[PDB]
Amino acid sequence: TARGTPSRFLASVLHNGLGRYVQQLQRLSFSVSRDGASSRGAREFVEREVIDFARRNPGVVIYVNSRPCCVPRVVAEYLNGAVREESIHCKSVEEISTLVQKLADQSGLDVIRIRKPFHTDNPSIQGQWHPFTNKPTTFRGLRPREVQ
């Protein structure tokens, strides 16, 4: 639930779209096993798709360890320092491809509840409403029931 979970506001990393778009994913690390059915899909992904992904994403350094700890994994490191570890255990080639593309597309910001679907640093152009907008002024600034 929202009340039992942290939240944040919609944001980019370094104003990621103002001047130029910088892909926030910078490192992928596939720990894959030579043997073991758990990493069969990872092995097929390394054989058939990792090269094409690498040449599609020149800004991402991709490592293939070929000796994992525990389950086969992909560790995605982002520019803002975020590290997201995704197990690729028993996933098919297409499942791993979609997961890796999702990691490439997303930023390093936490996948938690986002309070507002929008973020403006300049919410007002004509001036934020205050009680004295739309209130007429009076001669000599006389408040109500003032004698002079």
Binding site: L14, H15, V22, G59, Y63, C70, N80, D121, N122
Partner: protein
């Protein structure tokens, strides 16, 4: 005892995670952690920024003098990035000055200098370098990289870009990664000032205008603990700027700040920067 291994191993993994949360290991530079290839990382740096650096220049930009000294000290038992950082700092300051003076011709030279100081300051450049992964590729003698060294390396990278691709591409880089740091920022959030009323009086004297008359335009709950005052500064019975406040003095000071923003063309609703 219950036979089995998987639950026990799961519990050990959870204990290890909790231990890492409670007593995290001291931070270690990314180079000393697994899955690191410096050449690939430094190539991907340029490819990420969509710029054709020269690899030798970038490698020189990322190596600091303190790193060289520490390496020689260790060897007892390389071209530093000094000139590249100096070139990058000088060019960045001049190009930021050009950008800001073209955008805000009414801004005084002091204001432009303070804005450039903010944009090239340790905090802003530190944040930009950290989120551009300069720190990961930076060769320094101590970790985490101190903000001064990080700023020096970032400007060294800018100088390397200058030597590799030219002033126009470097200007685009500066616009994209330092000019954007003032988006959403307020003029006097970036340029700290004292006595805005006095500074406004100085500016009006430069414009050969008499000192503005501070005058109470609107007020609310004057005798309470939560008053609202609107104070307007009038130039020959003409309102130039009004500002709110809790006390009349605070409202007058804020009206002075609003007048300065309007004079310098750094109003909140000014034309947004063009990219």
């Amino acid at each position: 005892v219950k036979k089995g291994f998987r639950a026990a191993f799961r519990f050990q993994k959870e204990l290890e995670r909790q231990r890492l949360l409670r007593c995290p290991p001291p931070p270690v530079r990314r180079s000393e952690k697994p899955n690191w290839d410096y050449h690939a990382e430094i190539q991907a740096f340029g490819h990420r920024l969509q710029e054709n650096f020269s690899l030798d220049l970038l490698k020189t930009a990322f190596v600091n003098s303190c790193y060289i000294k520490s390496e020689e000290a260790k060897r007892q038992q390389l071209k530093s990035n000094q000139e590249l950082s100096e070139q990058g700092t000088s060019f960045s300051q001049t190009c930021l000055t050009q950008f800001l003076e073209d955008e805000y011709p009414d801004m005084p030279t002091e204001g432009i200098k303070n804005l450039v100081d903010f944009l090239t300051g340790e905090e802003v450049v530190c944040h930009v370098a950290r989120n551009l992964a300069v720190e990961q590729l930076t060769l320094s003698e101590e970790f985490p990289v101190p903000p001064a060294v990080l700023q020096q390396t970032f400007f060294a990278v800018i100088g390397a870009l200058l030597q590799s691709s030219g002033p126009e591409r470097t200007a685009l880089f500066i616009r994209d990664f330092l000019i954007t740091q003032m988006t959403g920022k307020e003029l006097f959030e970036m340029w700290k000032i004292i006595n805005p009323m006095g500074l406004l009086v100085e500016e009006l004297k430069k414009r050969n205008v008499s000192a503005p008359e501070s005058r109470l335009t609107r007020q609310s709950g004057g005798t309470t603990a939560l008053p609202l005052y609107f104070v307007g500064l009038y130039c020959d019975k003409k309102l130039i700027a009004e500002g709110p406040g809790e006390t009349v003095l605070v409202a007058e000071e804020e009206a002075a700040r609003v007048a300065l923003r309007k004079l310098y063309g750094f109003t909140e609703n000014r034309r947004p920067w063009n990219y």
